[PDB]
Ligand binder design. Structure first.
Ligand SMILES: Nc1ncnc2c1ncn2[C@@H]1O[C@H](COP(=O)(O)OP(=O)(O)NP(=O)(O)O)[C@@H](O)[C@H]1O
Ligand SMILES: Nc1ncnc2c1ncn2[C@@H]1O[C@H](COP(=O)(O)OP(=O)(O)NP(=O)(O)O)[C@@H](O)[C@H]1O
Ligand SMILES: Nc1c(C(=O)N[C@@H](CC(=O)O)C(=O)O)ncn1[C@@H]1O[C@H](COP(=O)(O)O)[C@@H](O)[C@H]1O
Ligand SMILES: Nc1c(C(=O)N[C@@H](CC(=O)O)C(=O)O)ncn1[C@@H]1O[C@H](COP(=O)(O)O)[C@@H](O)[C@H]1O
Ligand SMILES: [Mg+2]
Ligand SMILES: [Mg+2]
Ligand SMILES: [Mg+2]
Ligand SMILES: [Mg+2]
Lengths: 419, 419
């Protein structure tokens, strides 16, 4: 590992150039904890390893969901490799629950006020003035430029939407551990190579407020250190145990709590191309997808036996029925399983207007749903599993963001061809 | 006129009970101008008449548009009758252009920054603390109750949307006088009889910032008095002339700058019911609407002569063609006039799926549009005239608000039937 010059150093991290890696840097954590802009600073042994472990797990989680993130890989106990960014000097905060500075700036609001949707705020980075709140209008008027990207209305709107999405993903991911994510702070930078705005810096135990069972008095985050009247050695051991508590649970956010499976049943091997599109699209949400050939019309006995194989092994299953012309496979399956059935018929413009009604108009006592897009039927199957699986949910959530970002970028492009 | 007790008195107005009018009060203006929470106060002769005249014109304008407003009628030179309200102690501000307190609270924003859409802000009324900015969260948490109405999320969302709509109407109404409405402040109350939230207090020359030709140095509003280093008698005569300038122009906001007409051409007197619905709906936007009987099929010579009558008298006209079955009246009219033509065919479920295509699929060189709803065709005709007529525009704008308010009220009702 070919380490170059120390680029900068701050309160908790040293950033080094990597001579064998163009556009990449090494972020080495220090055994330092800090708070405020006064003398609250301490050595804390093992903090560097805890910060590194949390950020490395959280960045891998957000990256596997599809959030664009400045993270390459973990590099031992106390560092990580990242794409080099020109950091935007704004703290982006997201709140589910009103506490901390929100109450000070909004006297009359009580602790516990819930934000639907989560509240996003901006703070300009400046220790001299204790990080003052900025409006979107102030950030636009600053006309900041980083690695050649002017930070305008489009870029601010993107960081704002991304902050909400990142919060919701981390919020949903902590829920299975019976922890309430109250709020968080993140920072973005411009990747010096790609010129993309990406989540950067770290997300660690100083970034958020984490309340087991929603109970503030059980707070496990750095607020436990900020709240101390006086820092004693007995006080720092409590803080360290809180950081250890989070370090011991954070890797479980990468694990699937519940199993998911899509079974695509096709009446004919001529509709294989259409079923390959469903299977591929399921792969994008990390949901295993099996293809099976069975006809309701010509082998209804075999359809029910295949159904029984998937009903009988304890794995939650969504069936997707692909039947051309008069669809009996969706209906028959729908009538004989408690699991959901989606008809995704391979309609063409020739007879599709006529064929679709055999999926849509069903006798009473049948729940069978219809989705015409094959990518759509995978997404709907994912949305169903997202109710139980935070990993699938997070891919859906990040995909809503990324698609929205794509529209903003295409509008920005075509707007330049308006002069 | 049976005047009762003086209910309250402030810096500029005395409010009196009316013994012959239940739930109504008389707001008598005083010849006083004021600014800030210090000694800036002055007698100004004729100010009471100028304030009364402006508020009376502005309230009549907003009321004729369809904005719910605490105004009954003008009552001589210096008073007006209003429904009595329990006033909500919030100043609602709307901004098109960043100036004044927006720049102080957002250092870095330059004078002239434009808000798309117009920015709404709240200020809590308290002279002791110079009227501090409140968040929507602070107003909700105050749990204010006025004439029995709890001010909750629904009520705050309504005042916020109403503030934007009122600003946009006044903004559009000043445009024909080549005046830029920069920003404004309004207050709402609860009508003690109806229990509706309504625009109340006044809107006068102290309520807004008015720049002729967009030029701040020509400001005609009360900012001209606020800006004086020292108040001299020569200084007050300039302020008075600015107030007179606005008083002399404000009545022109009630006058139509451009004439509007809808001509509904029907192929058959059996479609008269359908044409009566278009005419009634046109009446709601204040647009005269004539009915005429002509067939393209059986009297095309007469169709063209009737067309010529309306093309030839210099009144801007939208033609609405009502033809059952094979619509030739829309197309023929569309091909022979430069004025817009709307086909509004009287479709029923029997043959409407078949008949509609004769309105929709036209030879090249025909602009003829289709609107199936008869109320819809009137609204579309209004939207066309709204590009030229601020009065029509304002009815459309207020109708978007009122419809949105209706949805919030129906959601609030059905939500109570969710327990
Ligand atoms: N991917 C990245 N590329 C380049 N610089 C980065 C990246 N991630 C973080 N940094 C910077 O690394 C520096 C050192 O981090 P740290 O020691 O935590 O600083 P700090 O004292 O918190 N300074 P600051 O964040 O500016 O208030 C920070 O100033 C970050 O801007
Ligand atoms: N329709 C109304 N019904 C009842 N009271 C009203 C109505 N419109 C205005 N008022 C009240 O009339 C009072 C007298 O007005 P004014 O003299 O302008 O007061 P002020 O000194 O500006 N006081 P304030 O608005 O409370 O800061 C105000 O306090 C308003 O709340
Ligand atoms: N961690 C930080 C910081 C921040 O600068 N923190 C450090 C400074 C440093 O990391 O070196 C500190 O002084 O404690 N700013 C916001 N937040 C987080 O943001 C949400 C809201 O915080 P609030 O604005 O209520 O204080 C909560 O989750 C904080 O942890
Ligand atoms: N007129 C007032 C008031 C207000 O309280 N005015 C008076 C008090 C009084 O009327 O007795 C004064 O002190 O001048 N607050 C906001 N505005 C209007 O609101 C927009 C924004 O004003 P900003 O917040 O920039 O000062 C601009 O159009 C003001 O005229
Ligand atoms: Mg901060
Ligand atoms: Mg930092
Ligand atoms: Mg004020
Ligand atoms: Mg007043």
């Amino acid at each position: 590992l070919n380490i170059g010059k120390k680029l900068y150093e701050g309160k908790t991290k040293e950033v080094y150039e990597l001579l064998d890696s163009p556009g990449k840097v090494l972020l080495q954590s220090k055994d330092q904890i800090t708070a405020g802009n006064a003398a609250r600073k301490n050595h804390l042994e093992g903090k560097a390893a805890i910060s590194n472990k949390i950020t490395s797990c959280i960045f891998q989680l957000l990256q596997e969901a599809g959030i664009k993130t400045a993270f390459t890989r973990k590099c031992g106990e106390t560092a990580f490799i990242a794409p080099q960014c020109e950091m935007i000097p704004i703290e982006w905060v997201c709140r589910r629950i009103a506490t901390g500075s929100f109450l000070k700036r909004n006297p009359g609001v009580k602790e516990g006020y819930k934000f639907y949707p989560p509240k996003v705020e901006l703070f300009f980075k400046d220790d001299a003035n204790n990080d003052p709140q900025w409006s979107e209008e102030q950030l636009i008027a600053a006309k900041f430029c980083f690695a050649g990207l002017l930070i305008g209305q489009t870029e601010v709107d993107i960081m704002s939407h991304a902050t909400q999405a990142i919060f919701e993903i981390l919020e949903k991911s902590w829920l299975p551990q019976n922890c309430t994510l109250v709020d968080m702070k993140i920072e973005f930078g411009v990747d010096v190579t790609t010129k993309e705005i990406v989540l950067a810096d770290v997300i660690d135990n100083d970034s958020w407020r984490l309340w087991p069972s929603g109970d503030r008095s059980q707070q496990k985050d750095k607020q436990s250190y900020r709240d101390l009247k006086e820092v004693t050695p007995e006080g720092l051991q409590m803080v360290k145990k809180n950081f250890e508590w989070v370090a011991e649970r954070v890797e479980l956010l990468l694990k699937s709590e519940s199993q998911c499976r899509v079974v695509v049943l096709m009446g004919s091997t001529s509709d294989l191309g259409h079923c390959e599109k469903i299977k591929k699209a399921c792969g994008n949400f990390g949901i295993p997808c099996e293809l099976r050939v069975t006809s309701a019309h010509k082998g209804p006995d075999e359809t029910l036996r295949i159904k029984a194989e998937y009903e009988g092994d304890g794995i939650p299953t969504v069936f997707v029925a692909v039947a051309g012309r008069s669809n009996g496979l969706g209906p028959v399956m729908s009538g004989n399983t408690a699991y959901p059935v989606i008809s995704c018929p391979p309609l063409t413009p020739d007879w599709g207007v006529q064929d679709v009604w055999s999926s849509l108009r069903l006798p009473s006592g049948l729940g069978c749903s219809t989705v015409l897009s094959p990518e759509g039927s995978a997404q709907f199957a994912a949305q169903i599993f997202g109710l139980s699986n935070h990993l699938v949910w997070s891919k859906l959530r990040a995909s809503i963001l990324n698609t929205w970002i794509s529209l903003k970028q295409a509008d920005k492009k075509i707007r330049e061809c308006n002069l």
